[PDB]
Amino acid sequence: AMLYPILTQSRMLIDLSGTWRFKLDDGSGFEKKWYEKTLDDAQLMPVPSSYNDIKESADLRDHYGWVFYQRDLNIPAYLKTQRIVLRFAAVTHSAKVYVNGTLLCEHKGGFLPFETEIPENLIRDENLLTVAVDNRIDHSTLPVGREDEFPYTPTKKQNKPNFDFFNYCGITRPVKLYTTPKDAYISDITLTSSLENNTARINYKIDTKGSAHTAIGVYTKQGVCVAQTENTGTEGSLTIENAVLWEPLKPYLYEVKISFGEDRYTLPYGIRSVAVKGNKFLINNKPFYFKGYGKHEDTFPAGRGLNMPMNAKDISLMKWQGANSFRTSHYPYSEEMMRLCDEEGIVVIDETTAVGVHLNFVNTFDPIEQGGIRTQSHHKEVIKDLIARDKNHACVVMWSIANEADTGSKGAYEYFKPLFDLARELDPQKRPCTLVSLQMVNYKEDCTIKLSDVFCLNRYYGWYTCGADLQAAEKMCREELEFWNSLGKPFMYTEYGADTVMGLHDTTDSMFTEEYQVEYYKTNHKVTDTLDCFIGEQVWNFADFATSQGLIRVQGNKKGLFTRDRKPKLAAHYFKERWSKIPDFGYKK
Amino acid sequence: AMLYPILTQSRMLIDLSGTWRFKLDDGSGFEKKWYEKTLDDAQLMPVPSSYNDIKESADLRDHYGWVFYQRDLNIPAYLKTQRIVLRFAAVTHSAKVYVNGTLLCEHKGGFLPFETEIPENLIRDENLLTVAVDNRIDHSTLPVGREDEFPYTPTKKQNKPNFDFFNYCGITRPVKLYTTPKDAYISDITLTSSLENNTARINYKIDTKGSAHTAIGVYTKQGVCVAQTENTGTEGSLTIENAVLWEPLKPYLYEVKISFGEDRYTLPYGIRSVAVKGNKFLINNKPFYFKGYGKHEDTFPAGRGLNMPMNAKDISLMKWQGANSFRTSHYPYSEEMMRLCDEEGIVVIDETTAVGVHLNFVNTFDPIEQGGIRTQSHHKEVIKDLIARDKNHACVVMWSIANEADTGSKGAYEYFKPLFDLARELDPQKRPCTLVSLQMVNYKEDCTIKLSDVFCLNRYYGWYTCGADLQAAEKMCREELEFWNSLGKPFMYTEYGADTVMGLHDTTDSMFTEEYQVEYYKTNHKVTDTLDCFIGEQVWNFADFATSQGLIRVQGNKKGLFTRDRKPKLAAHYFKERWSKIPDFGYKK
Ligand SMILES: CNc1ccc2c(n1)sc1c(N3CCN([C@@H]4O[C@H](C(=O)O)[C@@H](O)[C@H](O)[C@H]4O)CC3)nc(NC)nc12
Ligand SMILES: CNc1ccc2c(n1)sc1c(N3CCN([C@@H]4O[C@H](C(=O)O)[C@@H](O)[C@H](O)[C@H]4O)CC3)nc(NC)nc12
């Protein structure tokens, strides 16, 4: 259970972000127990941020292994009357947390929150908070790193990402200290909704620790109570007359206030339905057409780090462009972004960290004993933790189980079936599930056909195939997409695009130019607009972003409609025009 | 024999460049004999120019096969008292020339001149000049095209260059009509020189047609006769007291005036010596250090077409930068450029069209019967024609027989030995010969070791290997170059560089940025500056240039020190500083 920490009448919230001490591990940091004393000969690093781009050092940027963050933690003694909790919104990739040299908790997985109580007896008048952060990736991590997958011997050992984005690490999201009452407090809140005529019934389950009485109340934004049930135990339901539904680009959030003993917590909540029916993706019982992007959490210089002004700018640009949705490629995004999308009416496809589950791009899904991928156990944990964190978001309409796994190979169904079963069991709302499909010659053998509610395709007709032959791209696009269209279920693009360097131009089709980006998209839409079951277009990518170095990466990935500083390329204006003429609902009715 | 056409007291020179009629072949142009009538429904095309980039049409740009050029040719009747000759400085790749529907000549090879007399009886009051131009390349052309070397079927058949520059075709260089006397005229002039104390002896061979008397005279620029021999027949020699030698960056050209019958011709001529001695490249008996580039003939919008303002700009930039030399990668350049280099003092490595002689990047040098490369016969002709055209240029110091052929494979020596023998037999000055060596794991088996006077290496330590690991690049560079340095002969870089998009920057080593280009070069020079036998550095490339489309070509090749419009990147300023501190002679003495 991971409720978003908020300031309430029962809960202090103390942000510990700021300037922290920082030291690269030199191979002796654990042996010499750096976490027991003030870090010596240390640099300074902003928190939250990725550490890789803050300085001008390639050794820092390309570091392999651990780093140590540290700050002083002098807290008011009267907080010891409360339960004191340290929340790490995200530490990428793995973390060990020490208070005063005592290991308090460890965590695997770089993009989901974790927390630990601080034992009263450990707190002294002056305290040290140390966080060791591991950046290493391999066949057991999500995201996956390669291990052995004019030759040269590298100077130093480096991570080998099995994914096309830079391995930004550090204390990515805020660190906060919060409190709750000691004796009785709210642990989790689960809400589902059903529309009966114009009355909405909200089914609640309120998980608590300790012995006390539970109450739930629902308030409009303006502050009018529209439902209240007291001494209700853990499970129950209530009704809202003439409920205002949450709609894409027309958000409405109620305030759900919960009290348990002395503990008080407020959850914003939008009421809406999601259902796949035939070849339709229904939101509030109307056929939606996704218009949007795969994104990244990527800005300069914080890398993956939480950037709230940019989050606000990005949503503003989305609304300027006529988009209604994006996918959290390829990892859960910050709770701050997810709460802003609820507030602004932006639909989200919520994706796990499972990118790179593919050893043949030895078989990927061979037994662990025989060298197959070792991620399934952590993959279940990521699904559990992601749904636990984001289950109550109206903006989340679909779960993406993995990006571009080896789903056309033997064993894939066996790997993914338990994960789809888990996602459907744990999501109280029973939202659609998908995996995002890699382009593949044997696409009719993609195990997504056996598992997903929506077929989400990543296709590069006109870039990675048929480059500079868009007439051939159109023909090959049509041949494959007519297959998917024949299955009768909703399908969409979750990626399609072309690397485009702003400032490069040609009137005559030429890859990497701004004009070719437009013609690439025009050619794809010639096909998709004719296909009844194609219910969404999400470009790759919203904006240019950083990747590992290589001969095909022109200083990162250039498939953005926007540059990294959010300036529109020609194709950004093209999509503003196109999306201005396509309705959010009823385009293909 | 191909003397450069000039206006003389015996020779008219009429430029036929301008706006010509132009038509793509539709598959019926020869069958319907378009060359017998005015071209119907034709476009207009500038001559000289490549045709590919003049319009906005991909079908034109990417055309496969023939096109037809045509213009009217109404010539004064009294030129029929003279011998009338049509000179095509270059038609890329193959040409058929018609006057009034009569085929007058054909030519294979896109970068060297050819000419035909117009029979008096063919000339009418009004005449049509038609030139059919073939752009097709395969295993028999120089440069070589591939034949069979998520798969897709292309919309149209296209050329498949086995080389990294765009296949620009058309009437690349000027078309001119010139005259000579009918009865007796000068066909060729061959000059060699020997320095005895301060007196230069010039050995001449003057090839003529018809019966008349031959005379030779040598004049300073200011117009003073310094030697004259009359009624001298074909071969002879003369002496110049206190001769002024032609030097890199300090040119001096005499004017050699030849008369034969009524025919008169003036040849500019610089006196200088070239010799390889030990690990030294000696010009006028001093150890030269090449500073410069591989170039291309490439400008917008004429493509490969003669651009005399840009030729002057490029030499100016070369002198601004402190360079002293370039290589005519990968084809002979215009005579206009070569004559300007004589006038300006820029040293040239003169290269044939033989790029792409490599079928494994079936064995390249297997018998023609068994599918090996079919270029050796045309390769001999190119060597013959190139040396015939450029033999008298002081600026030409070395012949390059091929760029990046498959010289580490079996049969390579057998292919190249007759060509090196031919080049040494035909060059009256017996200048050094080389081939330009492709980077290759089995570099000790490169047959250049058995054939060349100078080892000319194309190496990309820090780009195509060790990318973003310049410490490893330095180590691998040193290991190989210490081998070449151990052989005791002069060697040099003829290519080394890194794709760099102007405007992309990072303080921390990042491929495609302007800073990485500088660090790439700094790392290579750390090695080359320590190696006694390394006598020259020619970067790839002088300027960004157009290539075929592909995932690693960011709108062409970006390894220029300058952009395509001749603006300096950071590394251009780096080389200005470096070359300002390295002397042309005596750097490694
Ligand atoms: C195992 N590591 C890898 C990966 C990819 C590649 C290599 N090694 S090697 C190489 C290569 N050769 C390198 C040398 N090259 C010369 O250098 C210039 C240049 O490439 O910039 C060319 O313009 C110039 O005309 C040529 O003389 C001509 C081909 N060419 C291309 N594609 C084009 N890709 C690769
Ligand atoms: C036979 N023709 C060729 C030649 C080269 C390549 C292909 N086909 S295919 C492919 C590929 N996949 C394509 C799909 N791709 C997704 O699209 C984005 C993107 O590549 O822009 C990624 O950012 C995003 O995270 C990924 O979900 C992830 C890998 N990736 C890379 N290198 C990275 N090269 C190639």
What's B514-571 look like in SS3?
HHHHHHHHHHHHHHHCCCCCEEEEEEECCECECCCCCCCCCCCECCCCECCCCCECHH
State the distance from the centre of ligand 2 to the C-alpha of B44, rounded, in angstroms: 42
What is d(CA B284, CA B271) in angstroms, rounded to the nearest whole number?
A: 9
Closest among B433, B456, B454, B326 to B383, alpha carbons compared: B433
Strand-by-strand arrangement of the B199-209 sheet: B185-196, B199-209, B235-240
What is d(CA B119, CA B86) in angstroms, rounded to the nearest whole number?
A: 11
* Contacts of B581 by beta carbon, 8 Å cutoff, 6+ apart: none
> Max CA-CA distance within chain A?
73
A404 is catalytic: yes
Q: Are B66 and B170 in contact (CB under 8 A)?
A: no
Indicate the SS3 state at residue A141: coil
**DSSP states along A426-480:** H-TT---EEEEEPP-TTGGG-THHHH-SSEEEE--BTTTBSTT-HHHHHHHHHHH
A369 is catalytic: no
What is d(CA B353, CA B417) in angstroms, rounded to the nearest whole number?
A: 17
Amino acid at A103: L
The enclosing H or E element of B21 equals: strand B18-24
Q: Which residues of B touch A154 (CB under 8 A)?
A: 469, 472
Ligand 1 contact via B327 beta carbon (within 6 Å)? no
Question: Strand locations in B211-362, DSSP E?
Answer: 214-219, 225-229, 235-240, 254-260, 263-269, 274-277, 280-283, 286-287, 290-294, 325-327, 347-351
Question: What torsion, rounded to 10 degrees, do the Cα atoms A485, A491, A492, A493 define?
Answer: -80
**Does the distance separating the beta carbons of B510 and A555 come in below 8 Å?**
yes
Q: Are B106 and B86 in contact (CB under 8 A)?
A: no
For residue A161, say if its preceding peptide bond is cis, omega within 30 degrees of 0: no
Token readout for A139 is: 């066949």
Token readout for A27 is: 């191979």
Catalytic residues of B: 404, 495
* Contacts of A586 by beta carbon, 8 Å cutoff, 6+ apart: A286, A287
**DSSP states along A256-300:** EEEEETTEEEEEEE----EEEETTEEEETTEEB-EEEEE----BT
Indicate the SS3 state at residue A368: helix
What is d(CA B401, CA A494) in angstroms, rounded to the nearest whole number?
A: 52
What is d(CA A292, CA A348) in angstroms, rounded to the nearest whole number?
A: 10
Q: Are A193 and A271 in contact (CB under 8 A)?
A: yes
Only one residue has tokens 């001529």, namely B269
The enclosing H or E element of A191 equals: strand A185-196
What is d(CA A324, CA A315) in angstroms, rounded to the nearest whole number?
A: 10
The enclosing H or E element of B95 equals: strand B94-99
Amino acid at B63: H
Q: State the resolution, in angstroms.
A: 1.8
Nearest CA in chain B to A153: B472
Only one residue has tokens 């989050």, namely A311
Cα radius of gyration rounded to whole Å, chain B = 24
Chain B: closest CA distance from residue A174 (Å): 27
The structure's method of determination equals X-ray
Active-site residue (options: A335, A495, A519, A537): A495
User: How many CB atoms are closer than 10 A to CB A215?
Assistant: 16
Q: Are B576 and B531 in contact (CB under 8 A)?
A: no
Q: Which residues of B touch A553 (CB under 8 A)?
A: 511-512
Nearest CA in chain B to A151: B465
* Buried-state track A28-61, b at ≥16 Cβ within 10 A, e below 16: ebeeeebbeeebeebbebbbbbbbbbbbeebebb
What is d(CA A416, CA A407) in angstroms, rounded to the nearest whole number?
A: 9
Q: Which residues of A touch B504 (CB under 8 A)?
A: 554-555
Closest among B441, B543, B522, B425 to B474, alpha carbons compared: B522
Question: Strand locations in B112-221, DSSP E?
Answer: 114-117, 128-134, 175-180, 185-196, 199-209, 214-219
Q: What is the DSSP secondary structure assignment for residue A189, as one 8-state letter?
A: E
Number of H helices, E strands in chain A: 9, 28
What is d(CA B425, CA B433) in angstroms, rounded to the nearest whole number?
A: 11
Number of H helices, E strands in chain B: 9, 28
Closest among A2, A248, A190 to A113, alpha carbons compared: A2
Indicate the SS3 state at residue A411: coil
Closest among A165, A159, A128 to A351, alpha carbons compared: A165
What is d(CA A454, CA A325) in angstroms, rounded to the nearest whole number?
A: 15
What is d(CA B560, CA A128) in angstroms, rounded to the nearest whole number?
A: 54
Q: What is the DSSP secondary structure assignment for residue A500, as one 8-state letter?
A: B
Closest among A42, A587, A508, A205 to B55, alpha carbons compared: A508
Taken in order A503, A504, A506, A511, is the CA torsion positive or negative? Answer: negative
Preceding-residue numbers of gaps in chain A (C–N over 2.5 Å): 149, 361
Q: Are A177 and A16 in contact (CB under 8 A)?
A: yes
What is d(CA B89, CA B104) in angstroms, rounded to the nearest whole number?
A: 16
Q: Are B183 and B164 in contact (CB under 8 A)?
A: no
User: How many CB atoms are closer than 10 A to CB B472?
Assistant: 20
Question: In terms of C-beta density within 10 A (0-12 exposed, 13-18 middle, 19 or more buried), how is residue B45 classed?
Answer: buried
Q: Closest partner residue to B509 among A58, A154, A465, by Cβ?
A: A58
Q: Which residues of A touch B468 (CB under 8 A)?
A: 549
Q: Are A511 and B549 in contact (CB under 8 A)?
A: yes
Q: How many CA atoms lie within 13 Å of B25's alpha carbon, on the beta-carbon side?
A: 22
Token readout for B507 is: 């303080």
Q: What is the DSSP secondary structure assignment for residue A120, as one 8-state letter?
A: G
Only one residue has tokens 């290997």, namely B465
User: How many CB atoms are closer than 10 A to CB A510?
Assistant: 21
Cα radius of gyration rounded to whole Å, chain A = 24
What is d(CA A271, CA A256) in angstroms, rounded to the nearest whole number?
A: 12
What is d(CA A561, CA A558) in angstroms, rounded to the nearest whole number?
A: 9
> Max CA-CA distance within chain B?
73
Nearest CA in chain B to A507: B56
∠ at Cα A576 (A571, A581), nearest 5°?
Answer: 125
Residues in A whose CB is inside 8 Å of some CB of B read 53, 56-58, 61, 150-155, 439, 441, 464-469, 471-473, 476, 501, 503-504, 506-513, 549-555
**Does the distance separating the beta carbons of B511 and A550 come in below 8 Å?**
yes
**Does the distance separating the beta carbons of A511 and B56 come in below 8 Å?**
no
For domain B275-580, the question of CATH label 3.20.20.80 is answered with yes
**H-helix segments, B259-369:** 308-321, 335-344
What is d(CA A364, CA A416) in angstroms, rounded to the nearest whole number?
A: 12
Closest among A130, A170, A175, A123 to A16, alpha carbons compared: A175
Ligand 1 contact via B404 beta carbon (within 6 Å)? yes
